[PDB]
Structure 1
Amino acid sequence: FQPTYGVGYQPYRVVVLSFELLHAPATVCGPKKSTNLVKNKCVNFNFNGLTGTGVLTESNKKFLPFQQFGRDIADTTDAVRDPQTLEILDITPCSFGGVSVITPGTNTSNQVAVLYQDVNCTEVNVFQTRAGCLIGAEHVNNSYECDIPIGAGICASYQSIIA
């Protein structure tokens, strides 16, 4: 090992790594990418191996320092602790509902209105009812007899389609 040696006689430090899996809990593993956390959006969340799809909002549940997950009565994960920053997030499920079409007879008219049940109007002639978001019906302050039932005291009729 003199410095004037040619390549093939020069000293080479060699490290050999041997990896093995046994009948034991495995613990050496590569780092897992932790992306930025976003809120108030319907995303596919993956918290420490717990996967799913839901809107992650800020939570008022004060967890104990050892507890990580949160379940309701029906064994669905509705709360989680972020591992990066020690904070609590609620998982509301992503917005879903039925899509119903309110129409008069096709002999009368071809105008329709669309009811998105249990859906807020900001994430779908747009009117917010307790039954859901109603698009295509003009809301009036006058009260009439129920022609087409919408629900929660709301009814639709044709005169354009009014609700």
Structure 2
Amino acid sequence: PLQSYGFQPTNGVGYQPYRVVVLSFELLHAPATVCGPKKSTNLVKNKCVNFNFNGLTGTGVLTESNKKFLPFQQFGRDIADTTDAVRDPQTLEILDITPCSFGGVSVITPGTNTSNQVAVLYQDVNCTEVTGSNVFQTRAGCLIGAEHVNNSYECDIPIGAGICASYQT
């Protein structure tokens, strides 16, 4: 029933032998155990990034953490299981996820019956992330277009955290 072929260097392609390897892909009721290689992108830390670590995602700034963990653990969690830390899958460092900065935009308006001089306060953000030439950092947010004075005065146009604006010559 089983016989050899007279395969020779002088036969044409239809008869010439070939070494054939066959790839066949199966799905059964089991956890998957095989896939191809994966490719990571380069890690950037102190910038807003749309991150994906082992399938877990979010947007933020990722920098070195002062947290400790068991060799076992991979992710840190905040309220309602929001990820607040990851360990890198390749680099054995714990990285703290700072949510990417957000806040409202508060516009400091003179009476329009006086002038068109307007400054803008960006809430919950540093003047590293927003700027312009007249850029000052307040406790409330990043203030651009206004100047700062060391003296105290009464309060006409509130910024927050003890800081309040007004108009002077």
TM-score range, shorter chain: over 0.9
Q: CA deviation at 1:74?
A: 4.5
Distance 2:60 2:128 in 1: 17
The structural deviation recorded for 1:88 is 0.8
Structure with bigger strand share is 1
Q: How far apart, in 2, do the equivalents of 1:26 and 1:76 lie?
A: 27
* Partner deviation per Cα, 1:73-96 (whole Å, 9 max, x = no partner): 443211101111121111100011
Give the Cα separation in 2 of the matches to 1:153 and 1:139.
13
In structure 2, relative to structure 1, the CA distance for the partners of 1:7 and 1:73 (3 Å cut) is closer
Distance 2:13 2:123 in 1: 76
Alpha-carbon distance, 1:68 to partner: 0.2
Structure 1 position 72, deviation (Å):
2.4
Cα offsets for 1:42-93 (capped at 9, x unmatched): 0011111111111110111121101000012443211101111121111100
Q: Give percent identity, aligned residues only.
A: 99
Per-residue CA deviations over 1:102-154 (Å, capped at 9, x if unaligned) read 11111111111100111101111211111111111111122211111111111
TM-score normalised according to structure 2 size: 0.89
Q: Runs of 5+ in structure 2 lacking a partner?
A: 1-6
Q: In structure 2, which of residues 17, 28, 32 is the aligned counterpart of residue 22 of structure 1?
A: 28
- State the aligned residue count: 160
Matched, 1:159 2:168: yes
RMSD: 1.3
SS at match of 1:121: coil
For structure 1, which segment, 71-80 or 126-135, has the greater mean C-alpha deviation from structure 2 after superposition?
71-80
Equivalence for 1:116: 122
Q: Once structures 1 and 2 are overlaid, which stretch shifts more, 30-39 or 70-79? A: 70-79
Runs of 4+ in 1 over 4 A off after TM superposition: none
